[PDB]
Amino acid sequence: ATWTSLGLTSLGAVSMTTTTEQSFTLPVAAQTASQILVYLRCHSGNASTTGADDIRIYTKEGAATYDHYLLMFPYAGQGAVGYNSDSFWLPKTSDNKIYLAHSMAPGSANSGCNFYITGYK
Ligand SMILES: [Cl-]
Ligand SMILES: [Cl-]
Ligand code: NA
């Protein structure tokens, strides 16, 4: 059940303004692993958008995708900070990439999304 921890190794800058599939190349240490452990967190305050953003996180091997999701629910105008996170395992596939896609772009205003690889085996 054990694995090699990478601490909070950022995977990259997450765009808040697109619903396109965002690609991140894995750090080289993880490129020989069989599985990767990732941590995705988000927060939204007085947002510029409203509605559910199911953020899709996945690796792929050919046509096969290995998908996880995280809810971000911006609500424009609110005077509070909402926040969510999840940490989950994905197969480390031959293209050495991991993907993130917003289903609704939450906007940059008063919001954030941070994406890390925290381990591998
Ligand atoms: Cl965040
Ligand atoms: Cl919340
Ligand atoms: Na929350």
Numbering used by the authors: 911 to 1031
Text of the article:
Bdellovibrio bacteriovorus is a bacterium that preys upon a wide range of other Gram-negative bacteria, entering their periplasm and consuming them from within. Proteomic and structural analyses of vesicle contents reveal several fibre-like proteins, which we name the mosaic adhesive trimer (MAT) superfamily, and show localization on the predator surface before prey encounter. Structural studies reveal a variety of domain usages (and therefore binding capabilities) at the fibre C-termini, placing these on intertwined trimeric β-prisms. Using independent but complementary approaches, we identified and characterized a MAT superfamily of trimeric fibre proteins with diverse adhesive tips, able to fulfil the long-sought-after role of multiplicity of molecular recognition and handling of diverse epitopes (across a wide prey range), by the bacterial predator B. bacteriovorus.
The β-sandwich tip domain of Bd2133 adopts a twisted fold, trimerizing about strand G989–W999 (burying 5,640 Å2 per monomer). There are several atoms lying on the three-fold axis. Solving a 1 Å tip-only variant (A910 onwards) allowed us to confidently model these as a water, a sodium and a chloride ion. Unexpectedly, there are no homologues of this domain in the PDB (judged by DALI16), but FoldSeek19 found strong homology to Synechococcaceae and Competibacter proteins.
